[PDB]
Amino acid sequence: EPKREVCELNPDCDELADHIGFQEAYRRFYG
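Now predict its structure.
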């Protein structure tokens, strides 16, 4: 899961993923 890999290594992305999941967080951060 490269999206999770990238997003987990950004505290803001990971925090967003805590709320909306990694795919949505990644899209909002790295879309």
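The radius of gyration is 7 Å.
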